[PDB]
Ligand binder design. Structure first.
Ligand SMILES: *[C@@H]1O[C@H](CO)[C@@H](O)[C@H](O)[C@H]1NC(C)=O
Ligand SMILES: *[C@@H]1O[C@H](CO)[C@@H](O)[C@H](O)[C@H]1NC(C)=O
Ligand SMILES: *[C@@H]1O[C@H](CO)[C@@H](O)[C@H](O)[C@H]1NC(C)=O
Ligand SMILES: *[C@@H]1O[C@H](CO)[C@@H](O)[C@H](O)[C@H]1NC(C)=O
Ligand SMILES: *[C@@H]1O[C@H](CO)[C@@H](O)[C@H](O)[C@H]1NC(C)=O
Ligand SMILES: [Cl-]
Ligand SMILES: [Zn+2]
Lengths: 596, 96
């Protein structure tokens, strides 16, 4: 009689029918991953069309329900997830315009090709770019290539981005949101939970607190990176001014991982390498997955169901078929999960396997939950749960214990300093770039600033917060920072910041429960079934209750914190601060490479 | 377990299970009901807004993992009531 019973019946219907269609779509996606023939291309075309039509029809018939007359929190959040119309809230002509422009973006980015002064060479984001940046140390090549690519992509997508700002603002306004910034913030909105309510600006205050408590560490690391750049090339960088954007080590300043060969403080010491050892033992993909499952059993997580080994593909299919093998794992369900990734004899493959195995375990943890809750409590929990296990496996004590590294060695001071430098430059270099991109997108959706000073204001703030300078000054006729992949396919970046914060918090709390003393980066989560049950206590939750409560089930705190970030790098920060006794700290935004 | 025998590739769509009725059940009862369930206090022809079909689909594939693989289950019911017993449990034989 009451609306609650009708809502529950419709959620059971949606659960079952969406399960059927999503299973079909995910099997089609795995077919895409394995066999890329035009036949399964068309099959996936019709499967996705049917799934989208079913989802739209279910949402439309769900729009007849009201959120005010229902009290159950799980059912309330399920209806809220159902009511997210998205593109259908606006007119058909506008929606088809938006989808055509997104297809245009996809085509342009996938076919983005830049010509050198000699047009005989044909590059396209992949044949070069990455390899140019990560193998060539020439200033002229990087400057010319990045400048030309940025210029052409901006030239081909400036008004597209402008109409995107307009249309996303209109969509958010039509969907009871002030701006598309609030639309993106709506994922973290939690209401109806006492002591667990969070608005759209509480996360903003938390991010500003992270800024305030993080700035000195990043400024010191920027000073060290720029000083090493001085030692490598003294005539192209000012001793106080900020560094040009094209001197960050990767495509767009996201990662400083490639700066290892120039930023290692002690090059004589041998890095922790088990590669030669796994060719000593002749390691294979089946053995690597068995080792991962041994590690997961050592933390009380369940075994590998036979379907995994039976249907999941663990090695490349020769040359008869081509497989895109970026480490990925979707949610098939009903106990069916599988992994597709290229298994080479490498150590980054160890991290990727561990990360996606943690992802699989988190995915299977909430299997018994309904469809709308069969996901991470927020968008970053899955990646954080994946990354914690890989980070734990990267410690040398684990390698010593599990036999890959022989017992008769001890941890060396400079080697562990280099390893901690690796884990620093591979993580903390992405946080400031995530902050800039997400904040710029935030006030782009807000509309506080006119169209006429976007690039100027953006680059000035870059110089002022992270010291990212344009090697060639650009006017309002450029769209350089919109060239990234995720902004180029409409994806939020808060996921990465939350992933890093959550993985550090989870490691801190899990190690505290597991009772390991000394430097924290050397701790391991092994033979700690109490900690395994503690982890499962949040793994099984899914989206039934707020992600803040899920975090409270591990750390005991309801909000994000910088304390894991500060504590994980205590000895590294001590060493940098004792070495910074005779170096400049800070930057000046006035200096630009073309102002002499 | 019955996966090779029952679950079929491209979808096994023969088994139907009900979900909703007017009231609760009684043990050992047959309720095959080709009557479309109604909700929202608006009786309808069926299969529309707030019109639910009680039976749903047993989506079965041979790749499903354990937890929802089609299981063949049979329940044997006995009664210890006074009556002429007819189903007696067998005897045995030995050497001479
Ligand atoms: C494997 O690829 C072929 C085309 O070469 C395709 O016909 C077949 O359906 C694919 N198999 C699967 C399981 O996707
Ligand atoms: C809320 O939903 C849960 C899960 O379906 C159920 O067990 C519980 O009884 C519901 N509570 C109310 C008040 O309907
Ligand atoms: C491992 O490497 C090769 C065999 O793969 C051989 O030298 C020896 O068995 C091992 N030790 C060293 C130092 O190479
Ligand atoms: C956990 O205990 C097993 C049992 O011997 C041992 O082989 C393994 O190395 C231990 N893991 C550690 C110490 O990380
Ligand atoms: C680190 O450990 C080494 C031993 O390999 C030792 O010689 C050195 O004094 C220690 N301290 C520093 C700062 O290197
Ligand atoms: Cl940039
Ligand atoms: Zn992944």
């Amino acid at each position: 009689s009451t609306t609650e019973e009708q809502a529950k019946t419709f959620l059971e219907k949606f659960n079952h029918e969406a399960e059927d269609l999503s299973y079909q779509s995910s099997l089609a996606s795995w077919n895409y991953n394995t066999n890329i023939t035009d036949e399964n291309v068309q099959k996936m075309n019709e499967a996705r069309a049917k799934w989208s039509a079913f989802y739209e029809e279910q949402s439309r018939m769900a729009k007849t329900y009201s959120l005010e007359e229902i009290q159950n929190l799980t059912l309330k959040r399920q209806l809220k997830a159902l009511q997210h119309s998205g593109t259908s809230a606006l007119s058909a002509e506008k929606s088809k315009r938006l989808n055509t422009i997104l297809n245009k973006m996809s085509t342009i980015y996938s076919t983005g090709k830049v010509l050198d002064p000699n047009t005989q060479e044909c590059l396209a984001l992949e044949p070069g770019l990455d390899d140019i940046m990560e193998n060539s140390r020439d200033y002229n090549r990087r400057l010319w290539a990045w400048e030309g690519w940025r210029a052409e992509v901006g030239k081909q997508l400036r008004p597209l981005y402008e109409e995107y700002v307009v249309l996303e603002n209109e969509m958010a306004r039509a969907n009871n949101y002030e701006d598309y910034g609030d639309y993106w913030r709506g994922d973290y909105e939690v209401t109806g939970a006492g002591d667990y309510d969070y608005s759209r600006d509480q996360l903003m205050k938390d991010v500003e607190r992270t800024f305030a408590e993080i700035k000195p560490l990043y400024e010191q690391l920027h000073a060290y990176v720029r000083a090493k750049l001085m030692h490598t090339y003294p005539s192209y960088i000012s001793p106080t001014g900020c560094l040009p954007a094209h001197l960050l080590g990767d495509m767009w300043g996201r990662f400083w991982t490639n700066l290892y060969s120039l930023t290692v403080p002690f090059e004589h010491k041998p890095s922790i390498d088990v590669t030669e050892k796994m060719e000593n033992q002749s390691w294979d993909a089946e053995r690597i997955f068995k080792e991962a499952e041994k590690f997961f059993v050592s933390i009380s997580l369940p075994y590998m169901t036979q379907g995994f080994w039976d249907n999941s593909m663990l090695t490349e299919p020769g040359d008869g078929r081509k497989v895109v093998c970026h480490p990925t794992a979707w949610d098939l369900g009903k106990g069916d999960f599988r992994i597709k990734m290229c298994t080479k004899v490498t150590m980054d493959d160890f991290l990727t396997a561990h990360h996606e195995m943690g992802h699989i375990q988190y995915d299977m943890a909430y299997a018994a939950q309904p469809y709308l809750l069969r996901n991470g409590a927020n968008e970053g929990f899955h990646e954080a749960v994946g990354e914690i296990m890989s980070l734990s496996a990267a410690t040398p004590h684990y390698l010593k214990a599990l036999g890959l590294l022989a017992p008769d060695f001890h941890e060396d001071n400079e080697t562990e300093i280099n390893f901690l430098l690796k884990q620093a430059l591979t993580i903390v270099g992405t946080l400031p770039f995530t902050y800039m991109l997400e904040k710029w997108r935030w006030m782009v959706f807000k509309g506080e600033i006119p169209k006429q000073q976007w690039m100027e204001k953006w680059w000035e703030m870059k110089r002022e917060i992270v010291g990212v300078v344009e090697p060639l000054p650009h006017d309002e006729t450029y769209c350089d920072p919109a060239c990234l992949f995720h902004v180029a396919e409409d994806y939020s970046f808060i996921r990465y910041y939350t992933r890093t914060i959550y993985q550090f918090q989870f490691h801190e709390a899990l190690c505290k429960t597991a009772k390991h003393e000394g430097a924290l980066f050397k701790c391991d989560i092994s033979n700690s079934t109490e900690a395994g049950q503690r982890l499962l206590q949040m793994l099984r939750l899914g989206k039934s209750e707020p992600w803040t409560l899920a975090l409270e089930n591990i750390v005991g705190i309801k909000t994000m914190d910088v304390k894991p970030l500060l504590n994980y790098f205590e000895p590294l920060f001590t060493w940098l601060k004792e070495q910074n006794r005779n170096s400049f700290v800070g930057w000046s935004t006035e200096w630009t490479p073309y102002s002499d | 377990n019955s996966n090779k025998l029952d679950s079929k590739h491209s979808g096994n769509y023969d088994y139907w299970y009900r979900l909703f009725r007017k009231s609760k059940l009684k043990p050992f009862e047959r309720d095959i009901s080709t009557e479309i369930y109604q909700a929202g206090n608006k009786p309808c022809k069926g299969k529309g807004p707030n019109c639910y079909f009680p039976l749903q689909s047993y989506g079965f594939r041979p790749t499903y993992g354990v937890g929802h693989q089609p299981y063949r289950v049979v329940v044997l019911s006995f009664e210890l009531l006074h009556a002429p017993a007819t189903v007696c449990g067998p005897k045995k034989s030995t050497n001479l």
